Structures are given as C-alpha cells and as structure tokens.
Amino acid sequence: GSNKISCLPRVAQNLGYHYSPDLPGFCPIPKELAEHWPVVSNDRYPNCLQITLQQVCELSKPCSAGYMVGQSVFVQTPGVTSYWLTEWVDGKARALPDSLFSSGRFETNSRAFLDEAEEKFAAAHPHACLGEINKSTVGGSAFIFSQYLPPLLPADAVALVGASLAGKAAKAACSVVDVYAPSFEPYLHPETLSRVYKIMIDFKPCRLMVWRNATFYVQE
Amino acid sequence: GSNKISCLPRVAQNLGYHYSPDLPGFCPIPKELAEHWPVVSNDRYPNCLQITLQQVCELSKPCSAGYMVGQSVFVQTPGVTSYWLTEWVDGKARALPDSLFSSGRFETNSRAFLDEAEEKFAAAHPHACLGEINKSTVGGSAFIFSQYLPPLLPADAVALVGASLAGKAAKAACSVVDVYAPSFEPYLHPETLSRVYKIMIDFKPCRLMVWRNATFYVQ
C-alpha cells in the first residue's frame, strides 16, 4: 500500500544502504537499477536490506526499535519486535552484527518513558539518566528523558552540544540518546570499576563508558 | 579591482588552507590579519596559497580542473588550464605536490562526458566504466558519468573522492570519481603486471590499483 513498514532511515544508512525504490524515507532509485545497486526495500533484490513485518530467513534479525509506517514515525513498544532485517548479499542472505536501537523518540520529540521499568531504571541510576549539577557544570544527562537538555535534538548518539541549567551551570558537549535505557543493564556489571565497550546503536559504531554503580554514557 | 578566481575549496582545504580575505568559498578573515596567518587568496601574503588565472613564477602549479569565479562553480574545460596555484611560505614560494583534480560535475548536478575523447576513453577502458564491484574492487567503483550510478548522488550518502562522506553515516553507498578520465593515462602503463600508485586527487592522497591492459580504480 501507500504506507509500508520501514526502519529509522539511519539504521539502514549506517549499514551502507542509502537508497530505496519503494520506501519513502530514503533516496529514490529507479525500479530497474535497484537490482544492480545496494538498496533498502520491502522486496527481495540481490544486494539489499529487506525490511519486513514477518521473518524471512533464520539469519534475519528482529529489532525492538523505533519504526515508521510510510511517512509517520512511531516509538518502540519495548519488549516487542518492530521489524526483521535481512541483508541480501549477491542473492544470498548474510548475518547482521549485534546492535542496540534508537526508540524513535527523537523524531517524535517525546521525552517520556516507554515502560514503567525504564521509569524505575531512571531513579535507580539518577546521575546518568536524570542528570545532576556540580559547580557550574552539568554532571550526567545521558538520555532524551533527562533534564537540562535543550528544546530540540538531532539523532543517534546525539552530541547535543549544550546542556544548561539557566544562570547556574552548563556543559558544552553533552551526549544523549533515545534507546530503551534498561537495554544497558547487561553492560553495568563490569568486573573492573571502569570499563569501555565497543557497541552499535542503529549500526553506528560507538563507545560506552561505564563506572560501576555511579554513571554511564554512550559516546561517539 | 579584482576577479574572484578559485579552486573547489577541498583543493585548498586538503592543502590545509581554510581562511580567505577575498574568495567566498572559504572561511572569511579580515584583510588586516591576512599577513599573520596562512590564507587562500588571489593576492600574495607572507604565508599563503595564491590562486590566479596565469602563472606567477616557475614554482606555480597549473591545474586543469573544476573551478569557481566567486560564489558560482564552473566545470573544467578539458585541455585548458583553469587556474595556477602558488604556495608562499615565509615570503618564498614552494613547489606543490603533483595531483589529479575533480572536474566540478558533482556540484553542478552533471553526469556528462566533458569531451568526445572521454566517452572514447571509457569505451577503451570498459572495466573503469560499467559495474559496481564487478570490474573494479574499491567500494566506490564509479565514475560520475556511469549508467550504473543512481540519478541522485547526495553527499551524505556518497563519498566524493577528493572529499569526505558527509554527515553521520558509517558506511557510504559508494564513492564517486568525479575526475576527467583520460588524466589517469600516465599511470596506465606500468612495466609490471599490477601496480599500486600512491597519488593525489585534489591533493588528498589515495592509492590507484592498475591491472595492466585490464582495469584501474582509486581506493
């Protein structure tokens, strides 16, 4: 139909897939050339990324992520799969890497929690999630629901250069993200005090700083 | 008083020049301060990359390439020199490195052969003309004139060689080679079977693989 299932564009673009013959949120491409080009679509092409409601192969990857049906974006329902991805390479499916996913909260400009659990996850880890002020500089604020953030924000491990508490404190280079916060629990038990992990949000490579039982933030 | 002749800014930016008192394609800077910092300009300063319509001295580098007079960009008229480049360092001129250059088709929405000769050259070298990864093996196996490229080539999705991939995307869709194709000819006759020439496009270093009488591609 007119409205078809898609990922948040950057999920495919980080993967190398910038054009689509059918999906609206990407570059347009003629229906012929899609067979001779790496594209993102709902239909099967030899080199492509196939986005779909159902599963297609065993190597398909389910993503509990932000999504869009046609033009409008929608936030993720946390536990539930939003779409399966299937990376076709030379007319034969390939395994996708591991990655976390942005919830679609940035593009809807919503600063509210998805779950009750995530709300609990916020007050459990206040500094990282809710932010904190420390002598003319903002302390944490790693998430889109955090305070001291500006009215408007871009996308995917967003270095929102600016976090303010008016006439009091400010950090010039604060980094935030709209991923389901309790997805970070597995990385919050390092055997060392500090630990750095190479991760993917929306298939963009980025680091995750963690101090055990104190603070964390994703960082590009 | 003065015309505003200029290179495609990446040419100077790859050379490590970002400011200009006169030329509009760069970061502005006051003429007063032009003495005390490296600039790109049509005038001479103590430290400067001078651009001009004709040669200044023996060390001046003639460039047949895409250019711009003022704000507006022009495609290279192949055969003829577009501008001369003259690097000044502490008053004295310095020999610039050699380089290939981009023709300017990318930033004027063009997909055309500049010459009849270029159309011939692509016919003469079919393995740097059709395909993407089939005949050459860089990720961006694509001249800008290729049928196999998409009609649209926005900088945030495609990696113009000479420049970088724009925006936050991790992997580019491809890499567009927007450069007059017969200018590769000096590197097309190695004495060995394979050769990897260390070369420059717009003074940005890169490797050019050359399988003799077969194919070639920038990396």
UniProtKB/Swiss-Prot annotation, chain B:
AV-Nsp11N/CoV-Nsp15M domain segment(s): 4-94
NendoU domain mapped to chain residues: 96-218
Top-level lineage group: Viruses
Secretion signal, residue range per the UniProt entry: none
Reactions catalysed according to its record: uridylyl-uridylyl-ribonucleotide-RNA = a 3'-end uridylyl-2',3'-cyclophospho-uridine-RNA + a 5'-end dephospho-ribonucleoside-RNA
Residues at the active site: 127, 142, 171
Functional summary from the UniProt entry: Plays a role in viral transcription/replication and prevents the simultaneous activation of host cell dsRNA sensors, such as MDA5/IFIH1, OAS, and PKR. Acts by degrading the 5'-polyuridines generated during replication of the poly(A) region of viral genomic and subgenomic RNAs. Catalyzes a two-step reaction in which a 2'3'-cyclic phosphate (2'3'-cP) is first generated by 2'-O transesterification, which is then hydrolyzed to a 3'-phosphate (3'-P). If not degraded, poly(U) RNA would hybridize with poly(A) RNA tails and activate host dsRNA sensors.
Protein name stated in the entry: Uridylate-specific endoribonuclease nsp11
Taxonomic source organism: Equine arteritis virus (strain Bucyrus)
Gene: rep
